[PDB]
A and B are shown apart, each in its own frame.
Chain A
Amino acid sequence: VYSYTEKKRIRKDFGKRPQVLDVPYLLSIQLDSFQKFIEQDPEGQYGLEAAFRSVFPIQSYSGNSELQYVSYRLGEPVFDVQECQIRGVTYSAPLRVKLRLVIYEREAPEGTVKDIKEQEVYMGEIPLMTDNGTFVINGTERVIVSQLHRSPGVFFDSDKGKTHSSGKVLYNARIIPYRGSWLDFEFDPKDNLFVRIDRRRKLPATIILRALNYTTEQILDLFFEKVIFEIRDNKLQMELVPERLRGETASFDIEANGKVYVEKGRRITARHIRQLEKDDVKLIEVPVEYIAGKVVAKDYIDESTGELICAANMELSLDLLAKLSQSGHKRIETLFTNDLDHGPYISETLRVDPTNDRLSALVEIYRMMRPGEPPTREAAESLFENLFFSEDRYDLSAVGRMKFNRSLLREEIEGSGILSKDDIIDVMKKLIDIRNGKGEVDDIDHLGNRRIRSVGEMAENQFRVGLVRVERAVKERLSLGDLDTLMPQDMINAKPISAAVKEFFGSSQLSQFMDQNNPLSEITHKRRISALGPGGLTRERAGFEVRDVHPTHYGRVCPIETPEGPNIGLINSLSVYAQTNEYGFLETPYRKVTDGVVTDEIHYLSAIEEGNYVIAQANSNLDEEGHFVEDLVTCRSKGESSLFSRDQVDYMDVSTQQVVSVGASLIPFLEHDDANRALMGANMQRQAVPTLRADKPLVGTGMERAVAVDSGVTAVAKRGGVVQYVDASRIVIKVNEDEMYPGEAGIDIYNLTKYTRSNQNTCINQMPCVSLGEPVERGDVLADGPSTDLGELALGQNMRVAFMPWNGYNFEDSILVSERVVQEDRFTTIHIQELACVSRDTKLGPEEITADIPNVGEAALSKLDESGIVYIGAEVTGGDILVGKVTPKGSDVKDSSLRVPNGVSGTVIDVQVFTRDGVEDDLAPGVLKIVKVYLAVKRRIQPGDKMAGRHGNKGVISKINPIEDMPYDENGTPVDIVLNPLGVPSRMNIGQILETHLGMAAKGIGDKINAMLKQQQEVAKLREFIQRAYDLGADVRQKVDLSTFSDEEVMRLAENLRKGMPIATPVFDGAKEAEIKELLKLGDLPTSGQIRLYDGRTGEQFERPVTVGYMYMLKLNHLVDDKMHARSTGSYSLVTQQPLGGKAQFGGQRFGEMEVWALEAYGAAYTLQEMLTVKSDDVNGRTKMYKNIVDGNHQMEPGMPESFNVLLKEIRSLGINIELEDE
């Protein structure tokens, strides 16, 4: 069964693997994030309720009044989205917050408040999201791009090689909170443990232990195990568990029980450990040279004399043993400092420590954190107890506590947001364990260690900034509060919240202007994962590994769609099936595989879960039950693609599109292209302009439907039914009764957005693709947007392309185009320019909007009214007048009248005017005369434009040939576009050839149907040929149910197929070559894909037959009459005497540094002298040169450049006396 615009033109779908999970809604990141931000969600998480339950109830410092919270709300926007874009306002909503002030008496923690008051106060306006995932910030339509940042929670990083210049590794450990102070632990090459807070000075780390009220003995209890020396009959014997001797040299005689176990000289093996455990050896008598290097654990005091024997962490000598033996402390606890495993790092750090108690530890930490200003008991204790341990200024979130408990192998995952003693001690213990050998480091590119921020999280953080500023203001007003003469808007202020949230949505590194020239480009700018932004890395610094693809990107981030240039791999784009985890990580679908039978249930995993399991490959042959047809299958275990058994796997990939994104899964024959050319192909495919006549890719992938629907450029029907079709203004849909509400009788009236400006000056336009009185279903499309054709996605157009060299006109990457491409207007795109004119009151009275234009004669009053402003629609070009806008006293009158820029033509499509109340409306103040004029240039195609296919084959269209000179085959049809075969062996993008052959076969079927329907046959022969065309070959998913198309839906389908039968070649499970040959045999075309072609010039055959087919070629928006520029003489800058830069400023070319070196490389001394003195800077030289040229005397009078005298005055404006010496 199919829907009714699905039976219009059903695309022949190759593809063998049955898909189990349909594609999710492609804008779900933006929409789910912002629906989390604004939603009335009780239990508090997450949203605006989390912000209000953190900041409220505010109580002042015993001021006996406590403003509390009830509920919030967002009213209607005063401006709907269209008139909001037209006017220039934000698309926002007012945030109505109920606030309940209760005010206490004296001595009421428990007492009832003396008075209440409550009102629905107004704080800020928050910008709502449009239904397509965009904002409208100040007239322009912007997009917040989801960030990719390091997760909160501990990270054990190594930095193995570069420091110390000696090959000795370090090991640092960063506890990254979501909000607050950063705590890092780090070794130094003396093997001492150092703490630093917020990248400040370096403190030896155990001082933080001494700041947590730990004595030295408790610290040595934590990080060391005790070895017991018992004072006995002679020589102070030792308790010896045999584990401690692992891998060391026997220094003494190891004997017990009257038996010599191990003699001196040999190392202790594990067999000797087994001998000591079998022989039950604990107590052995040691020599006095064994204790002469060990370190005491706890303190001991001489009992009778009443003084100290030794402090804790003191090494022992023989006379120290003579001190402690004669006193009466029989047990001696020593620190086992194994050189192999259990290193003495804490103990040597305690030897570095200049402190002894808790108070001096806090004084040293306070002198680290805030220097100069004195360290007193209260101040240092408040500092250190609010560094990590208060809920205000330090908060590992739920993500942070999950990562923090997971990296320490804790059992639980939910806990308190602050740290504790035990958490810092566990981070130090795991760091020491990593130094000892057990456990390993973490990598930072691993996407289980890399969280995503999105729109709701970022706006919530900015809103929390605004709320803590307004609670400091409420605490300000309340202690100065007199009652009862205030109601809660003398306390609260709507200004800081609105200021902060408009600061983020207007001027941030991620709230950025939407790439809007294409439905693909909208839908792939909204699905973007940037590594940049606040708190993340920068473009010009890092690095090599964060720019590189890591094995956790499989199914989360597209491997091949990343922009080339200065930021590669920082601006990653999200995969097709990848959702976002509850904590913000990237979870991708897999199919749960209990045993041999691969089950059709799906189950989502992130990269810290994908490592443990064994996950299969998407295309592994399984037949009729889910059993893998082989006994061994390629899977990947822990980021390592390896071959495993038939019955070991726990998950399988869902579908074979899932590695790549929605930009680079629209490329058919992706698997035959190179990776580089797929990258260039996807990045150029974002850049296509919408043509005037949208044209249905013959070789698509079937993902065109989901992109063209899910990006909101087409008018998808909300409720199904029939149609009334007034449509000149709006589609009117009568609703079927089952989908129709009992009250609100109701018929749906869709607004078509006609010719208007996009963000890239292209033309967004919707056209109805349903007739009058025609059934439509829910979810069906009604109006085709820009670059769409019956709900599919038509960026460029499909043209007949020959691969051959043609007389040099397609030399490096150029492209030679017939005249049939430019006669049919089949790339003639439509651009729209907005031009503003204002008549602000700068000085000497206000400016004026009158046709009575001066000096200039009846060449002003022309495309305007009888007395002012461009009339409505003519063919205006360059140098015309649109809005007469000139003042008197500015003879002394002048011409600021906004005219048409140089080089452009067009038709005035629209004139908007919300001018200074007097022009003879709704807008803001200040600005007076506000006249916006919308031109619409129609640019065709010309030598110099840029076209490209989908595979990375760039081209600048070189010659626009006549129809006659084209290479025609023996049937008579010219070929449209000639490309060059030499690009194909080097640039290994062989997929454009299979697209060429399969598009040739598609139009072969289209020509066959066009013959069977033009030379008109009764519909039995058409339905037989359509059935043969839709069966065609191997086991596929489509077949068709064609005998249920009522003898008319066969004919309407065959009316929509006579331009070529559309073929879906999916991404990695595409059409094989034998099916291309078999489809080329169904059409009457030659099997090789190659036709003999004659030459239009000479009429004689090209030897060695050439390839002709249909490639889907796109017109990119790098048009040549936006790049052509020239300057002889005009205006310059102010500070310098050199010319201005750019095209919108009529400026000249920067003759840079390497061009000066290139002229020095020749003998061009005079060319360089005029290149930097006369042509550029020296004012007397250039006026004398212009007069010398127009007299007919090519001679320069050089002089000295002005910018060098600017250099002299800037150097001389220091204390520097730079001069110019003798004649």
Chain B
Amino acid sequence: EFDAIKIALASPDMIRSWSFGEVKKPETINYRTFKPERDGLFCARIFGPVKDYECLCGKYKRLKHRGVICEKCGVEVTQTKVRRERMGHIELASPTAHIWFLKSL
């Protein structure tokens, strides 16, 4: 299936290629209900729908159009484990050097 594991540095183009959406707002969740934040850390469009094959907000409650993204939801339409593999990226305003390459001794 696969030979050796390769480790290298992460270019900003490589980190934008990993990503699926810029995580802007720090707002985690709503906390008074059950819904998350659009668009905060735990987003919908950047990552995926909490429920499997469902727009979290409201459209597609069967198995026909898996993928459509309406403007009222700003949500993808895939599996419950799809968010576990998808990662976001934070556009750091000011450059910050890595601590692992500045203090490794």
- Per-residue contact bits, chain A 1195-1223, to B (CB 8 Å; 1 contact, 0 not): 00000000001000100111111111111
In the complex, the answer to whether A1219 meets B9 with C-beta atoms within 8 Å is no
Given the interface pairs A843-B34, A1212-B18, A1212-B87, the reply to whether A1217 lies near B9 with Cβ below 8 Å is yes
Q: Tell me if B2 and A1222 are in contact (CB < 8 A).
A: yes
By a CB distance below 8 angstroms, the chain B residues around A1217 are 7-11, 14
Tell whether B4 is near chain A: CB-to-CB under 8 Å: yes
Residues of A within 8 A of B91 (CB): none
Task: For the complex, give the distance between the alpha carbons of A641 and B32 in Å.
Answer: 72
A1209 touches B9 (CB 8 A): no
Instruction: Establish whether residues A1221 and B10, one from each chain, have CB atoms under 8 Å apart when the complex forms.
Output: no
Q: Please judge, given known A-B contacts A843-B33, A1205-B85, A1213-B87, whether A1223 and B7 are in contact too, CB under 8 Å.
A: no
| Residues of chain A with a CB closer than 8 A to B7's CB | 1216-1219
Judged by a CB distance under 8 angstroms, whether B103 is at the interface is: no
User: In the complex, which residues 1-42 of chain B have their Cβ closer than 8 Å to any Cβ of chain A?
Assistant: 1-11, 14-15, 18, 33-34
CB distance from B64 to the nearest CB of A (A): 22
Residue of A1205, A1215, A1219, A1220 with highest tally of chain B CB at under 10 A? A1215
CA distance A1038 to B94 in the complex (A): 89
A843, closest chain B residue (CB):
B34
Tell me whether A1221 and B4 are in contact (CB under 8 A): yes
Query: In the complex the two chains form, what is the Cα distance from A775 to B89 in whole Å?
Result: 84
Quick check: is B65 within 8 A (CB to CB) of the other chain? no
The smallest beta-carbon distance between A1002 and chain B, in angstroms, is 69
Q: Which residue of B lies closest to A1222 (CB)?
A: B3
Select from chain A the residue with minimum beta-carbon distance to B14.
A1217
- Indicate if the CB atoms of A1219 and B5 lie closer than 8 Å: yes
Assembly CA distance A1220 to B6 (angstroms): 6
Distance in Å from the Cβ of B86 to the closest Cβ of chain A? 9
User: Which residues of chain A have C-beta atoms less than 8 A from B11's C-beta?
Assistant: 1217
Find out whether the CB atom of B10 lies under 8 angstroms from the CB atom of A1215: yes
Q: Give the one of A843, A1217, A1218 with max B CB within 10 A.
A: A1217
Majority secondary structure, A binding face:
loop
Distance (Å) between the CB of A1134 and the closest chain B CB? 10
Q: Give the CA-CA distance A1215 to B15 in the complex, in Å.
A: 8
A1209-B3 CB under 8 A given contacts A843-B33, A1217-B9, A1217-B14: no
Q: Are A1220 and B5 in contact (CB under 8 A)?
A: yes
For the side of the interface on B, what is the size category? Answer: 20 to 34
Given that A1209-B85, A1209-B87 are contacting pairs, would A1220 and B14 also be in contact in the complex, using a CB cutoff of 8 Å?
no
Contacts of A1218 in B (CB 8 A): 5-7
Query: Are B6 and A1221 in contact, CB atoms less than 8 angstroms apart?
Result: yes
Within 8 Å CB of A1209, what residues of B? 84-85, 87
Contact of A1223 with B1 in the complex, beta carbons under 8 Å: yes
Report chain B residues within 8 Å CB of A1213: 87
A410 to B34, CA, bound (A): 71
Is B62 engaged at the interface, CB distance under 8 Å to the other chain? no
- The docked-state distance in angstroms from the alpha carbon of A1221 to that of B4 is 6
Cβ A1223 vs Cβ B34 within 8 A: no
Confirm or deny: B72 has a beta carbon within 8 angstroms of a beta carbon on chain A. no
Contact of A1220 among B2, B84, B101 (CB under 8 A): B2
User: Are B14 and A1221 closer than 8 Å at their CB atoms?
Assistant: no
**B2→A1223 contact, CB < 8 A:** yes
Q: Which residue of B lies closest to A1206 (CB)?
A: B84
Write out the residue numbers on chain A whose beta carbons fall within 8 Å of the beta carbon of B4. 1221
Docked Cα-Cα span, A1221 to B7, in Å, equals: 10
- The complex places the Cα of A1186 from the Cα of B43 at a distance, in Å, of 35
A171 to chain B, nearest CB (A): 34
| Bound: A1220/B1 CA distance, A | 10
Contact of B6 among A1212, A1219, A1223 (CB under 8 A): A1219
Write out the residue numbers on chain A whose beta carbons fall within 8 Å of the beta carbon of B3.
1221-1222
The smallest C-beta distance from A367 to any residue of chain B, in angstroms, reads: 26
Contacts of A1214 in B (CB 8 A): 10, 98, 100
CA distance A107 to B74 in the complex (A): 72
Query: How distant is the Cα of A300 from the Cα of B101 in the complex, in angstroms?
Result: 60
- The complex places the Cα of A1214 from the Cα of B89 at a distance, in Å, of 11
Decide if B6 touches A1216 in the complex (CB within 8 Å): no
**From residue A867, how far is it (CB to closest CB) to chain B in Å?**
31
Complex interface bits, A940-972 against B, C-beta within 8 A gives 1, otherwise 0: 000000000000000000000000000000000
B15 to chain A, nearest CB (A): 8
Within 8 A of A (CB), among B83-105: 84-85, 87, 98, 100-101
**Contact indicator per residue, chain B 50-92, by CB within 8 Å of chain A (1) or not (0):** 0000000000000000000000000000000000110100000
Q: Which residues of A contact B9 (CB under 8 A)?
A: 1215-1217
Instruction: Across the A-B interface, give the 4 residue pairs with the lowest CB-CB distance, nearest first.
Output: A1217-B10, A1215-B10, A1217-B8, A1218-B7
Given contacts A1220-B6, A1222-B2, 19 further A-B contacts (CB under 8 A): A843-B33, A843-B34, A1209-B84, A1212-B18, A1212-B87, A1213-B87, A1215-B10, A1216-B7, A1217-B7, A1218-B5, A1218-B6, A1218-B7, A1219-B8, A1220-B2, A1220-B5, A1221-B4, A1221-B5, A1221-B6, A1222-B3
- A: residues with CB less than 8 A from B are 843, 1205, 1209, 1212-1223
11 contacts between A and B (CB under 8 A): A1212-B10, A1213-B87, A1214-B100, A1215-B10, A1216-B8, A1217-B9, A1217-B14, A1219-B6, A1221-B2, A1222-B3, A1223-B2
